[model samples]
Target: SHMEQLKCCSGILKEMFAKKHAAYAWPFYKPVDVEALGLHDYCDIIKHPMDMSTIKSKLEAREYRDAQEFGADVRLMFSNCYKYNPPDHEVVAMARKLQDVFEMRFAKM
Candidate 1:
């Protein structure tokens, strides 16, 4: 159960950042920064592992769920940023794409 949930979160994140320059595409913040917002033990859990499997196996089901929830919050933050910020079409478009992926993968489920 924990593995499946962790994989889901990992897959979504991979999809979100797959594009060129995608990592820098977020208008206001990086993924790590945004994810860190709702992740209580962000550094300990997320930043400590070079291998995702290591982190995933170490995470409890609750932690996996929290990561998913944090993903939703990050999606909302991107949506709101897209709404209020004008110009910089490329950045907005990238953010929109990332948001779309998040919506299709996480929000709809």
Candidate 2:
């Protein structure tokens, strides 16, 4: 079950963060220049919506094998939301879509 998987993974991440004494640091405080930060190339790629619809479709159809393959891709796309500055709305939309897929798949079980 995806919910169980999420819960287990969340626990692991929380433990890892606690062990490391991780502190949240704002990456951007004083606004400088995006190009100066060498993030222009990254900006180009993540500024647009990622195509996770195929993964969603596969999950909808209950194709677990193909969905699992594309799951990694969707996860990567979600991770990049922070690395590259996309619109906040775009990030939220992607996150919602991902959650929807997770919920649908979990509901099947």
The candidate that achieves the highest TM-score relative to the unseen native structure: 1
**Each model's C-alpha lDDT?**
0.52, 0.44
- Model 2, range 1-109, lDDT digits (tens) per residue? 5545444433432332342322321121122245776755765666533334443444456554433444464455555554564466554454554445444544453
Off by over 4 Å in 1: 1-3, 20-64, 87-89, 107-109
lDDT tens per residue, model 1, 2-108: 45665677666565556553564444333344364564554553432122232334343445465555465555556555554475867677667656666787754
Q: Which candidate is the best by lDDT?
A: 1
RMSD of every candidate to native, in Å, equals 9.1, 12.6
Alpha-carbon runs more than 4 Å astray in model 2? 1-39, 43-50, 53-65, 86-97, 103-109
Worst 10 residues of 2 by lDDT: 21-30
Model 1, position 12: C-alpha lDDT score: 61
Candidate 2's displacement at residue 45, Å, is 8.0
